[PDB]
C-alpha cells in the first residue's frame, strides 16, 4: 500500500476525527446541571430523554476524553471534560459503604441499580487509570487501585482461576444463569486484560504486571478455542464451555433468540471480539516490553480467522458473528466490530506483514466512511443491513457512546504512522 | 472401646492438660518487659537465650491461648494471655506502611526479618480469627480480614489458582528457588484451609465461605496425590510437581536421619483430613462430601505410619506405602491423635481406635516430659530423645494443646455414640 494511499487514509481519519466525531460529543455531552455526561442522542443528534447515566456510559466517556487528550486531540477541553466525568464517578457512583462503583444512576445522579458488575468495574479501572495518565490527577489511580483490590478480594476464583462477574451491592455473588453468578465470560476477561494494561502503565507496580500477565494467560489458555484460537463467549466456573445466554444485566443490544439463547449457543464466535483481543494483546505486550512473538500463535489465529471469515469482501465491513470452524451466522454490520477490525487489521499487517490485512483494512475503512458514518452529525450508525442500510438509528444511548469509534480513529492513525515509517 | 476405656483416656488427657501442659506455659511465657511471649525453653524449662520473637511463635501462642480459652480451660487467664500476644502482634509485628505481619522480631520487639511470608500470615488469620471468637475483641477479626485481603491482592495467582508464598516487605514477589517465589506448597495451602475455616467461623461472610471451599478444592484437586490422595509437598505455579527444596525462610529444623521425591507425611495427611472434616462441620456439609479423599488420607496413615511395636507415628514414607523415616517427631503424634479419632467417627472401623490408643500411649508413656509438662520434640523410633529443647522459635504449643483439647472433644462424641 503506497505512501500516498497511507497518507490519504490517515488524512480522512484525522479530518473526520477533528471536525466531525469529537465536536459531536464536545458540543453535546457535558451535563453541568446534574453532573456527568448526557449520552442519549437520536438520529438527529437530539436528546432522546432516557433517564439513565450508566456506569458504562460515564466511565467510557471518561476513558474517551482522557485517551483522546493524551493522544493530542480535542485541544485542551477533553481533559477538563474527563475531570468532570471523574467527579461524577466518585461523587455519584462510588459505593462509600461497600466500595466499588454502582451499575446505574439516573439523570439526577441517584443510584437506581446498585449491583457490582465486573464488566463495568473493568471500565472503571481502564478509564480512571487512563485519566491519571492523561492528567496527573491522582484520584484516577486511587480509585482504579481500590477497584482492582476489590476485584481480587471478591471476584477472583482462587481454585479455578479467573473471575466471577456479577454481585449484589454488598458483594455477595448473584444467583445462577441470567442473574450472572455462575459464568465466566470472554467479554469480562478480555476487558480486564485491557484495563490491567493501562493500570500497569499508570502504576508501574509488580502486582499489576504479574496479574496482567496472569489475565493474558487465562485468555489464551482457557478462553480461546483450543483448536481455532477464537474467543468462546461463556464458561462455567470450571472453564468447561457454557451455553451462551443473555444476562439480566446488559451493556449492549446483542441479539438472542426469544428464550435468551444464541442460536448455536455452544459454537459462536465474534470476529470483532477476536480482532479486539488480538490487538489489545499486542498493546499489552508493548506496555510489558515483550515482543509480539511472545504470543505469535494466538495472534496469528485471531487475525487469520477474522480476515478469512469476518470480512465482507463484496459489500464492505465485518459480519457480526459465526462458527469457530468458519460458517457465518449473521451478516449484519454493527458499529463496534468495524472499529475493532480497523485497529486489528493494521496490527495484523504490522506484525504478520501480509498485504491481505491491508486489503482487509481498507475494505473496512471504506465501509465505515462511505456507509456507516452519519456524516451530517459525525457519529456512527449502530446497526445496518449487510449492504449498509441503517437498521437502528440512534446515535448513542446508555451503551453506545464514543469508546469504540474515537479509539479506532486515534489508534488507526497511530498504526498507519508506524506502517508509513517502515517505508 | 468400652465406655470405661474412653473415660480413662479422656481423664488422662484432661488431668495432664490442666495440671501439666497449660501450667508449663502459663507460668513462663508472658513477657511483661518487652511485650509478647517467651518461647525459648530448654529441657529443664529454662530460658535458653535466643533473641527471637518469630511471627510463628507469637501467632501460634495467640491461637493456643484463644482456643484453649474458648473451649473453657485455663480458669480465664488464657484470654488475658491471648490479649497480651495480640497487643504484640499489632504493635510490633504489623507493617503500618505496607500491611501484613513481619516474619521476625527480636526479643526487644524490633523487626529483624521484614518479609511477608504466607505460611506465617496463615497463622495470623487463624490465631486472630480465633482470638475474636474467644474474646469478642474485634481487633482479631480486623487484622485477620486485613491480612486476608492482602493475600487476595498480592498472593493469589489468578491464572493457575492458589497462592505464591513469599514476598519482600513491600509485597514484591521473592525470587525463584530457595528465595521462595516460584513454588506452591502443601504446607501453606493446607494451613490456609485451616485459617480460612476459623476466619469464616468468625465473620460468617459469604466471601470467606466461598474461598474456604475454593481452598479445599485446590487441596483435593491439585495438592493430594492423584492416585493415593496423600499430600505432595511442592508444586510449580502450574501445579506440576516440583523437586523438594529447602527455603531460605524456615519455620523448623531439617532433621537428617542417617537411616527420594515420592515422600509424604502421615501427620500432614492426618492433619489435612481432620481439619477438612472440621471445615465441613463449620460449613454444614457432611463428611462424605469428600468421602474418597478422607478415606485415602486416614487409610494410608494407619496402614503405613503407625508403629505397632514401639508406638507413635513415623515421620514420612512413600505415597505407595514404604516407610522412609521411623523417627518420632512431636507434632505428627498430635495430629494423629485427632485424626484417628475422626477416622473412627466417620469410617467406623475399629483399627482407627486401636491406632488412636497406640499413639495416645506413646505420647503419654514416652513423649511427654512429665517433669515439665511439654513434649520431647524429636525421638528415636523406640522413644529416646534426639533433641531436648522444650520449645523455641518454631515449637511452641500449637500442635499439642490443640490435640489434647480436640481429642477430648471427639472422645466425648465417640462415648455418646457407643
Ligand atoms: O468487546 C466489545 C464489548 O464488550 C461489546 O461486547 C459491548 O457489548 C459493546 O462494546 C457495547 O456497545
Amino acid at each position: 500500500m503506497t505512501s500516498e494511499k497511507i497518507a490519504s487514509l490517515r488524512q480522512e481519519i484525522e479530518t473526520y476525527l477533528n471536525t466531525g466525531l469529537l465536536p459531536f460529543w464536545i458540543t453535546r455531552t457535558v451535563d453541568k446541571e446534574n453532573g456527568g455526561f448526557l449520552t442519549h442522542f437520536d438520529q438527529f443528534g437530539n436528546d432522546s430523554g432516557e433517564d439513565e447515566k450508566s456506569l458504562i456510559a460515564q466511565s467510557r466517556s471518561v476513558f474517551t476524553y482522557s485517551s483522546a487528550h493524551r493522544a493530542g486531540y480535542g485541544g485542551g477541553v477533553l481533559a477538563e471534560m474527563a475531570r468532570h466525568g471523574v467527579d461524577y464517578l466518585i461523587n455519584n457512583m462510588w459505593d462509600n459503604e461497600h466500595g466499588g462503583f454502582y451499575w446505574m444512576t439516573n439523570r439526577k445522579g441517584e443510584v437506581t441499580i446498585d449491583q457490582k458488575i465486573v464488566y463495568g468495574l473493568s471500565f472503571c479501572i481502564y478509564s480512571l487509570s487512563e485519566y491519571t495518565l492523561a492528567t496527573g490527577d491522582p484520584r484516577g489511580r486511587e480509585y482504579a487501585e481500590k477497584t482492582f483490590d476489590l476485584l481480587q478480594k471478591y471476584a477472583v476464583d482462587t481454585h479455578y482461576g479467573g473471575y466471577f462477574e456479577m454481585f449484589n451491592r454488598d458483594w455477595t455473588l448473584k444467583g445462577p444463569g441470567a442473574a450472572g453468578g455462575d459464568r465466566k465470560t470472554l467479554d469480562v476477561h478480555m476487558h480486564l486484560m485491557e484495563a490491567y494494561t493501562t493500570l500497569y502503565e499508570c502504576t508501574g507496580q509488580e502486582i499489576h504486571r504479574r496479574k496482567l500477565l496472569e489475565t493474558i494467560e487465562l485468555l489464551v489458555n482457557k478462553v480461546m478455542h483450543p483448536e481455532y484460537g477464537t474467543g468462546i463467549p461463556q464458561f462455567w466456573a470450571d472453564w468447561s464451555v457454557a451455553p451462551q445466554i443473555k444476562f439480566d444485566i446488559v451493556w449492549g443490544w446483542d441479539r438472542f433468540n426469544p428464550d435468551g439463547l444464541k442460536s448455536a449457543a455452544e459454537d459462536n464466535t465474534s470476529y470483532g471480539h477476536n480482532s479486539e483481543f488480538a490487538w489489545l494483546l499486542m498493546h499489552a505486550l508493548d506496555i510489558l516490553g515483550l515482543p509480539y512473538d511472545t504470543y505469535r500463535e494466538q495472534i496469528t489465529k485471531s487475525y487469520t480467522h477474522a480476515v478469512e471469515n469476518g470480512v465482507d469482501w463484496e459489500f464492505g465491513g465485518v459480519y457480526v458473528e459465526g462458527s469457530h470452524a468458519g460458517q457465518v451466522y449473521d451478516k449484519e454490520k454493527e458499529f463496534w466490530q468495524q472499529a475493532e477490525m480497523l485497529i486489528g487489521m493494521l496490527d495484523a499487517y504490522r506484525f504478520l506483514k501480509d498485504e491481505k490485512y491491508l486489503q482487509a483494512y481498507e475494505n473496512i475503512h471504506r465501509f465505515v466512511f462511505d456507509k456507516m458514518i452519519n456524516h451530517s452529525l459525525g457519529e456512527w450508525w449502530p446497526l445496518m443491513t449487510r449492504e449498509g442500510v441503517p437498521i437502528w438509528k440512534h446515535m448513542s444511548h446508555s451503551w453506545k457512546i464514543n469508546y469504540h469509534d474515537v479509539r479506532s480513529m486515534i489508534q488507526s492513525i497511530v498504526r498507519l504512522d508506524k506502517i508509513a515509517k517502515g517505508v
Side-chain angles (χ1 to χ4, degrees), chain A:
Chain A
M1 175 193 287
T2 72
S3 323
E4 303 60 53
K5 180 44 80 52
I6 301 281
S8 282
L9 301 168
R10 177 197 202 287
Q11 190 57 73
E12 182 169 25
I13 294 158
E14 186 174 81
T15 292
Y16 158 67
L17 178 60
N18 279 329
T19 70
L21 178 50
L22 294 176
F24 172 95
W25 288 99
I26 287 157
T27 68
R28 289 175 176 75
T29 194
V30 179
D31 184 340
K32 305 216 140 137
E33 183 43 31
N34 310 101
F37 300 110
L38 301 153
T39 69
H40 291 85
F41 299 115
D42 69 13
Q43 73 172 295
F44 304 119
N46 298 316
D47 181 354
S48 47
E50 284 91 343
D51 188 22
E52 291 194 328
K53 299 206 171 132
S54 69
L55 187 59
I56 287 299
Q58 302 308 290
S59 59
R60 278 177 175 178
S61 305
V62 167
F63 167 80
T64 283
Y65 306 139
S66 305
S67 51
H69 173 91
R70 173 154 82 108
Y73 299 84
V77 64
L78 292 197
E80 178 74 3
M81 284 168 59
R83 170 168 318 244
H84 176 83
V86 169
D87 293 353
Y88 189 81
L89 292 175
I90 287 153
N91 296 331
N92 284 93
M93 308 204 73
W94 178 257
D95 180 347
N96 281 293
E97 188 193 346
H98 305 286
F101 296 93
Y102 297 118
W103 182 244
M104 184 71 69
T105 62
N106 65 15
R107 210 170 269 230
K108 312 213 167 316
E110 307 167 317
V111 177
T112 54
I113 304 179
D114 61 8
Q115 298 177 34
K116 302 289 163 63
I117 306 298
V118 178
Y119 185 83
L121 301 179
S122 190
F123 270 87
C124 289
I125 290 164
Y126 193 37
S127 68
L128 295 160
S129 291
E130 179 80 18
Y131 169 74
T132 286
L133 278 160
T135 73
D137 178 352
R139 297 183 300 157
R141 175 193 182 148
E142 175 192 1
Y143 282 84
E145 289 183 308
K146 279 179 194 291
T147 308
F148 179 89
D149 294 354
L150 291 159
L151 291 186
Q152 303 308 291
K153 168 174 186 177
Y154 288 117
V156 167
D157 174 345
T158 70
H159 166 219
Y160 285 130
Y163 298 74
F164 297 100
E165 306 183 351
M166 299 209 196
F167 307 83
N168 303 301
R169 180 186 171 190
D170 65 9
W171 289 104
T172 59
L173 191 62
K174 288 189 76 203
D182 68 8
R183 281 165 159 80
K184 296 165 172 178
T185 69
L186 168 69
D187 216 3
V188 161
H189 281 69
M190 171 202 333
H191 282 283
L192 285 170
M193 179 193 67
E194 154 198 74
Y196 291 176
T197 293
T198 313
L199 173 65
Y200 175 55
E201 186 186 2
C202 180
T203 78
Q205 298 185 223
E206 192 254 295
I207 191 52
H208 296 141
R209 180 180 185 96
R210 169 161 31 104
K211 301 231 166 170
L212 171 54
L213 283 158
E214 282 171 13
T215 310
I216 292 174
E217 285 287 298
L218 266 180
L219 284 151
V220 167
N221 301 323
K222 288 173 163 165
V223 179
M224 300 306 146
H225 196 284
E227 167 171 4
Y228 302 105
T230 39
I232 299 159
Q234 297 187 356
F235 299 81
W236 304 113
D238 71 0
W239 294 112
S240 64
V241 179
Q244 182 169 356
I245 60 172
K246 181 188 176 142
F247 299 111
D248 299 325
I249 297 284
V250 308
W251 47 82
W253 279 9
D254 303 57
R255 277 69 70 207
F256 297 86
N257 74 26
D259 289 313
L261 291 135
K262 286 291 176 171
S263 309
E266 311 266 50
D267 178 16
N268 191 82
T269 202
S270 157
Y271 318 105
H273 261 289
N274 297 337
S275 159
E276 184 171 29
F277 164 66
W279 84 256
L280 278 161
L281 171 53
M282 281 169 54
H283 173 65
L285 295 168
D286 285 343
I287 293 299
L288 294 161
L290 300 175
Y292 306 138
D293 313 57
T294 304
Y295 294 102
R296 171 168 292 269
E297 187 191 353
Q298 176 59 66
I299 296 163
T300 300
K301 283 182 181 167
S302 302
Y303 289 145
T304 293
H305 190 276
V307 65
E308 296 224 356
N309 305 294
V311 173
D312 183 352
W313 291 116
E314 280 166 355
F315 298 105
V318 59
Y319 306 129
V320 176
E321 66 201 359
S323 166
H324 295 277
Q327 188 199 347
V328 181
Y329 292 156
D330 178 358
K331 285 168 180 259
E332 286 180 350
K333 306 282 175 64
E334 189 163 26
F335 75 97
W336 65 262
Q337 298 94 327
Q338 322 308 318
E340 295 313 312
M341 280 289 287
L342 286 177
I343 305 166
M345 294 297 96
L346 296 174
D347 275 348
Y349 180 70
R350 288 181 55 236
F351 174 48
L352 306 167
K353 319 267 59 154
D354 194 326
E355 244 274 359
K356 79 189 173 177
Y357 294 114
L358 282 181
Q359 192 91 313
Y361 168 84
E362 187 170 11
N363 172 299
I364 295 148
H365 180 119
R366 289 265 52 86
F367 173 82
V368 168
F369 278 93
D370 302 339
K371 276 156 166 186
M372 178 161 278
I373 289 164
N374 178 8
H375 281 282
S376 62
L377 291 184
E379 251 301 326
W380 298 19
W381 298 113
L383 184 66
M384 339 183 79
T385 68
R386 183 192 174 185
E387 303 202 4
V389 178
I391 298 173
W392 288 337
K393 282 171 178 170
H394 59 275
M395 294 300 263
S396 64
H397 51 37
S398 278
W399 323 123
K400 172 173 193 294
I401 305 94
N402 54 27
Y403 147 65
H404 284 288
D405 58 6
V406 169
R407 182 171 76 177
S408 68
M409 305 296 84
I410 294 173
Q411 296 313 315
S412 287
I413 288 174
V414 164
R415 285 142 183 79
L416 284 167
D417 287 341
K418 300 190 169 171
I419 286 159
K421 275 226 288 143
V423 188

